[PDB]
């Protein structure tokens, strides 16, 4: 069996890639081999607006109100927008098929071939590894019993949302382990639901505050406070030593000694780029950033690009990196799809991300947004309600967070791009309508 | 604003081998080598070896040397006639290889597929190879030294350096070689060979315990140094230069250890700096570990940019990311880059190797990860890295460089015609129960 564009993984980058492949190559035959039985869907509403919707039937429909009151599905497109795997090689105008429930287990890079779990083989011409990541689990939950594992869940998928929101109607306490994006958003989502249902929502993580890897300390702190205000028990500086079952419920034991009892743990502890295919593939992984080491164009080897969460790419302006964001999956998937159809475009228009942690934390971020970098923050009118945060390297702005600053990403994009050695970052903040 | 389908930046071995690879695979390919060096692509090995062993009084003029068979050879890869001019290249039937000598690419516009040269001219390309090699590192002790001393201290890389140094070897009472690596050792041996007739004082000083300390296990390095001494070299191992000045009309090297060397001339053979200036304007990734441009298994940097030779930091699928600065590697990587520039999509796979000679008792070959930082097992004939030997005569043997219970590198020590065995051993990743049984494969028994 053969397909021109084999997108390994049925996610956002694969869909964006399938879309940009199809935008750039309107006849393209794209087989998404998706080990997931679900058709591609955006993950963000699984931790945001799928929770915000009225209608108990939201869980079945998987539909959500957008920023304007217009509703839409989590699925990138109706199932009827896809052609079947069997029809894919034959259907006129090509299309996008998803072989759902099938996993690529061997990447014969030399042979441009994948072997699936069912022993079946598919060759390809262009391959996007858009395998994303699997939620890292906690060492403590792996070494724990069959009982605790049956009530600890990872969160990535529709089934995780469905399990979790069902659980959110069934149990009285859900603990989110992880202080990054997903922890913080699931915290807030569950927080919002707890307004009407009264469920306990605990969020816990090793850093000083939410988004610790991302936000400078002062701002990570201001944010944690906003997440708390969403109805979340936020527990920073938390390292899990072990997890057991106790009194029907789960008992999480922290290194510092604190202990969380909860009915259900969601561990959002970062992502392991799914690089299993590298070994048989002879593909280089980045030992620093993880993921498949790819260049500015998302390319690993001649016919293999990697996009989305699994891609460790070179940013010409910002250096080598890996980014795990929907818009990056979209941007890099789109880019890889463009590059898979020959754009030879380096990553350049920066992917951004946004996060909402309640109504007072709406931010957008671009570039090297890493709390390990020097930063300069300038804020309106400590009150960090509105401001702009500059991540700096070699006397130059390398990352920007637009903090409740709306409609200014263009300006941020421009500062990142220009590598100006700013005489006065206070004058630069004024560009973001921060005085 | 000219254009060339294949642009190779740098006019050395890698560029040459890429040129001939591109040409082999894409016959009729038009390939422009841009070379800041006024000289055409030449091989550097004889500059430290056979051009000194020549007793031809004209060898500095001719740059010719006799090979193994006694057949004479130029250090140039091919004669100047075998290249097309840069003007003729866009047009010449079935393309070929042009060299823009004395021209430095000073800007690489990767987006616009373009380079800008030092005279301000621009060249677009379809596929580009960066093969800029490296430039000898200088000793900062010389850099900070005065005008007089600097003008009596030479780097050694190029034909010009051979000529200057060989001239100096007939004028002065004493030359000091600084550096104990490949080039220092070979030049010291070269000069020592010379001193048997000239009575010139030949001194070699380097920080390592013995010659070739970065690649040979110590016992072998030491044995090698004794062989170098016996070449008529005052070998001063363990030497780090503190300052160089002028005293009594002669150079005065002051070593950190307090030794002084009064000498008339200094050559500093202190390693190579990969030439990566174009990464900057190019927005090309440099490898901060190995130095050089960072490229994949296929030696590819960007859609249309590859890198090869001393300047290429590449991914070895079986052995990992590396950069090698060896003639045969410049050959192997240039060859491969060339192939990939022409669609081959092939990973580095066939391993390059190297060799060195330090007088008549020291001739060796090496393949894979040959690095005195690796564990080694050496097996020799009767007559902090682990350095094992299998039962002071290190006249002949095989040295296995190990990683992950697998041979990842091999040195064949006065063992000739066994590289393919070494190579298979490297390739097969067998976990050998008995390296003495493996050494039997090398006629060590
Ligand atoms: C709940 C949630 C919410 C988010 N919200 C936001 C947000 O608001 N803003 C933001 O910027 N980012 C957000 N993100 C991050 C964003 O969704 C990810 O960056 C994005 O999903 C990356 O997509 P991907 O296609 O690279 O990987 P994935 O979406 O992980 O898709 C990869 C797919 O490939 C499959 N796969 C793996 N290996 C194989 C194999 N060998 N064979 C076949 N299939 C395989 C996996 O099962 C998976 O289905 C969110 C993520 C989650 C999980
Ligand atoms: C005296 C000597 C002896 C050696 N003996 C041995 C040996 O016995 N065995 C062995 O294995 N190896 C030996 N080597 C090492 C071997 O010669 C090198 O590995 C090989 O020369 C590397 O080839 P290259 O093409 O990568 O780089 P180089 O040969 O350095 O060629 C690069 C060329 O590109 C030019 N260049 C740089 N930047 C630009 C630019 N921007 N624009 C245009 N041109 C540019 C440089 O000036 C240079 O001329 C020896 C080296 C020397 C110096
Ligand atoms: N708006 C958004 O950008 C958004 C929203 C939801 C999800 N996501 C994405 O979803 C993916 C998964 O999200 P995530 O939040 O799990 O990852 P993340 O990288 O955002 O955060 C990882 C967090 O896990 C925690 N962690 C790491 N090691 C730990 C350890 N061993 N023990 C306990 N905690 C540990 C830390 O708190 C760390 O900040 C990420 O790729 C993320 O980018 C993004
Ligand atoms: N047979 C061969 O493979 C061969 C022969 C000659 C030259 N070469 C090549 O030529 C290039 C240059 O040769 P090289 O011998 O200069 O490089 P090298 O890397 O082989 O040796 C560097 C040596 O320089 C000396 N050194 C480094 N820093 C020093 C310091 N600051 N002070 C004093 N000494 C210092 C050390 O002895 C070290 O071994 C290399 O790329 C090398 O591979 C190879």
From Swiss-Prot, chain B:
Transmembrane segments: none annotated. Keywords: Acetylation, Apoptosis, Cytoplasm, DNA-binding, FAD, Flavoprotein, Isopeptide bond, Membrane, Mitochondrion, Mitochondrion inner membrane, NAD, Nucleus, Oxidoreductase, Phosphoprotein, Transit peptide, Ubl conjugation. Under normal conditions, a 54-residue N-terminal segment is first proteolytically removed during or just after translocation into the mitochondrial intermembrane space (IMS) by the mitochondrial processing peptidase (MPP) to form the inner-membrane-anchored mature form (AIFmit). During apoptosis, it is further proteolytically processed at amino-acid position 101 leading to the generation of the mature form, which is confined to the mitochondrial IMS in a soluble form (AIFsol). Ubiquitination by XIAP/BIRC4 does not lead to proteasomal degradation. Ubiquitination at Lys-127 by XIAP/BIRC4 blocks its ability to bind DNA and induce chromatin degradation, thereby inhibiting its ability to induce cell death. The modification N6-acetyllysine is found at residues 260, 427. Residues 6-355 are annotated as: FAD-dependent oxidoreductase. GO terms for molecular function: DNA binding; electron-transferring-flavoprotein dehydrogenase activity; FAD binding; NAD(P)H oxidase H2O2-forming activity; NADH dehydrogenase activity; poly-ADP-D-ribose binding; protein dimerization activity. Expressed in cortical neurons (at protein level). NAD(+) 1 binds at residues 180-183, 208, 214, 271, 325-326, 355. It comes from the Eukaryota. Its cofactor is FAD. Belongs to the FAD-dependent oxidoreductase family. This is Apoptosis-inducing factor 1, mitochondrial. The chain holds residues 128 to 610 of 612 of the full protein.
């Amino acid at each position: 069996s053969h397909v021109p564009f084999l997108l390994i993984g049925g996610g956002t980058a694969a869909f964006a890639a399938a879309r940009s492949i199809r935008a750039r190559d309107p006849g393209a035959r794209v087989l998404i081999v998706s080990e997931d039985p679900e058709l591609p869907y955006m993950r963000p509403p699984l931790s945001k607006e799928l929770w915000f919707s009225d209608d108990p039937n939201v869980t079945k429909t998987l539909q959500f109100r957008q920023w304007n009151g217009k509703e839409r599905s989590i699925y990138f497109q109706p199932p009827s927008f896809y052609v079947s795997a069997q029809d894919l090689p034959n259907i006129e105008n090509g299309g996008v098929a998803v072989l759902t429930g099938k996993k690529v287990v061997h990447l014969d890079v030399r042979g441009n071939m994948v072997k699936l779990n069912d022993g079946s083989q598919i060759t390809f011409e262009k391959c996007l590894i858009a395998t994303g990541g699997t939620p890292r689990s906690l060492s403590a939950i792996d070494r724990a019993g069959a009982e605790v594992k049956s009530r600890t869940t990872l969160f990535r998928k529709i089934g995780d949302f469905r399990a979790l929101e069902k659980i959110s109607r069934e149990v009285k306490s859900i603990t989110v382990i992880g202080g990054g994006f997903l922890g913080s958003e699931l915290a807030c989502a569950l927080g919002r639901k707890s307004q009407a249902s009264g469920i306990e929502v605990i969020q816990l993580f090793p850093e000083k505050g939410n988004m610790g890897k991302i936000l400078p300390q002062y701002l990570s702190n201001w944010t944690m406070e906003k997440v708390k205000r969403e109805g979340v028990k936020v527990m920073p500086n938390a390292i899990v030593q072990s997890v057991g079952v106790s009194g029907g419920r789960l008992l999480i034991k922290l290194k510092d000694g604190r202990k969380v009892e909860t009915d259900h743990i969601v561990t959002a502890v970062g992502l392991e780029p799914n690089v299993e295919l590298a070994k048989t593939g002879g593909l280089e992984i980045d030992s620093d950033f993880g993921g498949f080491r790819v260049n500015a164009e998302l390319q690993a080897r001649s016919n293999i690009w990697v996009a989305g969460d699994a891609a460790c790419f070179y940013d010409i302006k910002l250096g080598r990196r890996r980014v795990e964001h929907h818009d990056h999956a979209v941007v890099s998937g789109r880019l890889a799809g463009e590059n898979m159809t020959g754009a030879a475009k380096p990553y350049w228009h920066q992917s951004m991300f946004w996060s909402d942690l309640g109504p007072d934390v709406g931010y957008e971020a671009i570039g090297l947004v890493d709390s390990s970098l020097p930063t300069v923050g300038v804020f309106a009118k400590e009150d960090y309600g509105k401001g702009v945060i500059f991540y700096l390297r070699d006397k130059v702005v390398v990352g920007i967070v637009l903090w409740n600053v709306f409609n200014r990403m263009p300006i941020a994009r421009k500062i990142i791009k220009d590598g100006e050695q700013h005489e006065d970052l206070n004058e630069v903040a004024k560009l973001f309508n921060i005085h």
